Design a protein around this ligand. Structure first.
Ligand SMILES: CCc1nc(Cn2ccccc2=O)no1
Length: 185
């Protein structure tokens, strides 16, 4: 791919974070805390899962960013509608306003309904996310494997402004504490 020149500087929005997340001072890293992080509740916060949104909203153009997933066992990444449900239980699907991939129990899957198996030969340490708003495309790239394509959502019906979407995943196992990090441009 040759999408690197649409690079955007993403920062995390504290106010959208699950109350157990710890976001770094620079707003570029997020990890699971071992307890509630002593913040007030609000209608924006994801309640059921360890999720947070980027601050940036996109309604046009081409955008690209990279995320470090080194040594994590579980995570979700992609984009979502600004209007997605925050409270209670829901599935990650385009019908619910999410265009995502994930790692879970040693398999990679795209968040279609039902989910799609991904064929990754080189487990990624960094993931590239490309959005073309006008084209209706969200693509995922394996930066560890020379930028190889992971998955393309096409014919997307965004139906609103998009936000970068993150899930650090639970840490029941003690093997998933590592952060998600937004990688430098
Ligand atoms: C949304 C609630 C929540 N709790 C935790 C953190 N947590 C707590 C116990 C066991 C595993 C584990 O990951 N993360 O989200």
């Amino acid at each position: 791919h040759h999408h690197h020149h649409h690079m955007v500087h993403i920062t995390l929005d504290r106010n959208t974070a699950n109350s157990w997340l710890i976001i770094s001072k620079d707003r570029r890293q997020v990890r699971m805390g071992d307890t509630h992080q002593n913040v007030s509740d609000n209608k924006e916060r994801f309640s059921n899962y360890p999720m947070v949104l980027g601050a940036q909203r996109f309604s046009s153009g081409k955008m690209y960013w990279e995320v470090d997933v080194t040594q994590k066992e579980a995570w979700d990444l992609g984009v979502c509608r600004d209007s997605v449900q925050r409270k209670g239980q829901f599935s990650l699907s385009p019908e619910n306003g999410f265009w995502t991939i994930w790692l879970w129990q040693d398999s990679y899957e795209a968040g279609t309904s039902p989910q799609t198996t991904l064929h990754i030969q080189v487990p990624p340490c960094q993931i590239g996310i490309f959005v073309d708003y006008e084209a209706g495309v969200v693509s995922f790239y394996n930066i560890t494997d020379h930028g190889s394509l992971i998955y393309t959502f096409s014919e997307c019906v965004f139906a609103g402004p998009l936000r970068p979407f993150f899930n650090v995943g639970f840490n029941y196992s003690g093997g998933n504490a590592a952060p998600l990090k937004l990688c430098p441009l």
